[PDB]
Design a protein around this ligand. Sequence first.
Ligand SMILES: [Zn+2]
Ligand SMILES: [Zn+2]
Ligand SMILES: [Zn+2]
Ligand SMILES: [Zn+2]
Lengths: 427, 427
Amino acid sequence: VTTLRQTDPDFEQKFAAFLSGDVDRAVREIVDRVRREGDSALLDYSRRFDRIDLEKTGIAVTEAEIDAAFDAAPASTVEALKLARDRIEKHHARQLPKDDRYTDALGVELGSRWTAIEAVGLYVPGGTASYPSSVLMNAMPAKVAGVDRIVMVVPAPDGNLNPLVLVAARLAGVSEIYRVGGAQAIAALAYGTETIRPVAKIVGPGNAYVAAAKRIVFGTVGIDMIAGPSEVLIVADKDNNPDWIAADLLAQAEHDTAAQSILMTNDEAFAHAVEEAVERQLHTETASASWRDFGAVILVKDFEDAIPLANRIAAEHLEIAVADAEAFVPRIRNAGSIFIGGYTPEVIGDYVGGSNHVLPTARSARFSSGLSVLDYMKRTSLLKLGSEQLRALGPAAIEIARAEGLDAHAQSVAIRLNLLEHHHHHH
Amino acid sequence: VTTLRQTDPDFEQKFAAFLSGDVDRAVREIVDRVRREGDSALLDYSRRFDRIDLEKTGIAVTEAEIDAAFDAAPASTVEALKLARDRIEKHHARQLPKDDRYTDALGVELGSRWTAIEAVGLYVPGGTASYPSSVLMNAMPAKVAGVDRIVMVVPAPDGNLNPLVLVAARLAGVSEIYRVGGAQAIAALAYGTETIRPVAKIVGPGNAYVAAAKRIVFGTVGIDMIAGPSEVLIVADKDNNPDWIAADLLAQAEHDTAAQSILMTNDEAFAHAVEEAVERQLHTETASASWRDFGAVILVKDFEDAIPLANRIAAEHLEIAVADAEAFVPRIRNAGSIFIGGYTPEVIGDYVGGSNHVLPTARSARFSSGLSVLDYMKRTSLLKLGSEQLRALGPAAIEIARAEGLDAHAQSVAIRLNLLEHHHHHH
Ligand SMILES: [Zn+2]
Ligand SMILES: [Zn+2]
Ligand SMILES: [Zn+2]
Ligand SMILES: [Zn+2]
């Protein structure tokens, strides 16, 4: 496994290189066609890519089909999904924003008010990449935020849908479910078709076609972020169970073939002990291809050294397993989620922690946060000036407007001050 | 001026049509070249588009050049910019997020922590579109949020820079200023060059080239939103000064040739009185082309009717001038900023209100908010489970992981529970 040593005269060059790292035309055409033509183009693309005939199966999934999904599900799985839904809901409810209206010293009334986005669409991959936990994580915050209409699009290749996805959808307050995917589904959500009324925002990672479609429609609808390769950074000292740390690195690896698992430690023997555990557990596929191709160990002399390196890696998931861990939490500023101690494997956050696992990937923790209720809401600014306030702030506005050559802007203030001033000749 | 009447059997069709409504290849190449080549490609593109030779003028603006800018500025303009900076700062400080760490009923420790984005870049148009108010509005929130490095890129066509932009930059805590623009500047900020170290997020509306460049780099850096045509919606009854309302419609029009100003009223005579005022003031250019080409009046019978229409328009700027205005504020959920009463022209919000004027355009108020300190910060989730908590939540996680075919994920929990369980045979 790749191993970098901070003291190496070439460490910086190798570390920076380690951190570094089309379908546009086809997608541009698919998006434009769905926009201009609607349902018929949706059915057309679904045939080409999902080998399904929506004319016969229908575009929308029925409540009856969702009921059948519930009955087919093992009781313990439905129960587990409900516990996860309940934990996620309670956690997100705490993050609801509070409005703020106040009067400043000049008597100006300033306000901040939050409302939910009216309709939101959740993109959920189809087939073997179709996970019910993803559905709860993406839909529950919208439900908590108060979104009136929650739509889910999920492709059904060869007509197959994971029934657990339908089970999760209901548990999380999803209102409409449509059997479509790819750039065509993204276009339908953004522009609308005869059957699918448009939404105001689309969330949910997808493949290259979905990603390209989202870059196009951004502006017409809001979008969460572009899906990028996932990574876990584990910062651990020798006082850990090597098998446990290995299991955590492998859990992240099975996720995707390009997923990356990094161990940052100050004890080489421990790093060796973790690599041996990774090897044994690897027997007793995607994780194999993932750990070998992208796995890595970074050796530092102490954890003060690990701080700047961890900040540059800016991992989606950061497991901190060192003595006095709570002390490093505030020092490591770039991380989507931080899991503390030996009993908190990243996996728990994917399912039952309650904290949203849909986190920023590919160094995006440098500028973004994981999904929260805020992503499903928006703030409106409120401002009210009375005559006194306009008299006090208007001149400054006029000065700036005129300095900017914006005479109409200056006049909208001057036309008011010119009349008002006749009542202020005393001062 | 275009006039729609809600009762018209064809109103809905006309209103919906009223609401509706390339360089990609060239930009894709410019962005890729700057990424691969650095400074030399920056200088190359700057010559082609700004007719400037950065080899002689230099890429970075010097402190000395900024000092000269201050001296050349009229005292009242510097003072006005400072009052605006102070109002914006005090307002934004109130919006700083608070961290939240707590322990739930199961003893799970959950946390929410906020940090500032380390480096941010502000794109400011050059030439006659170069406004100092824009600089304060875009930079001040980053300064309040605690951004360590604030960078501004501003093209200097034919070597000319608005000195007031340099004055504002300093007042707002901008650290570095570079004389570059377009897709080349966006590429330099996102990928970095020898002279310009990369930033984590880029904010600031630009032209079609800037917009295309931002769509490309999104993911590598965060981006605010894509600039779209601006619009003001004024909902007013007859108890207003027609000249004042006209001035407000014209102020928004001079902004851009595609800017849109809409009057929504329940009194046709008043609408006529406003149109006549717009005509007289139009004499005593861009505003002219803007009001005629995109201006519009929407007649309703009462303001209850105006609510759903205003929500569909979802204007960047909404001026509410009706009796009992405070009553409609909560009913109109989609609006970037709401200005209340006759003494609050939208213009005040652009400069001295304190509330950020960089608001969502082209119906984006349906899903986004105007710039705030939150846009310059990010949240990190914290999670800590002890043995008891993992014992209580682990089984559910395993159940879901296995139902999803994610065995490595299930094992990272099972490997811990398998050892831990020997201490829990009593229950
Ligand atoms: Zn050290
Ligand atoms: Zn995971
Ligand atoms: Zn009515
Ligand atoms: Zn304005």
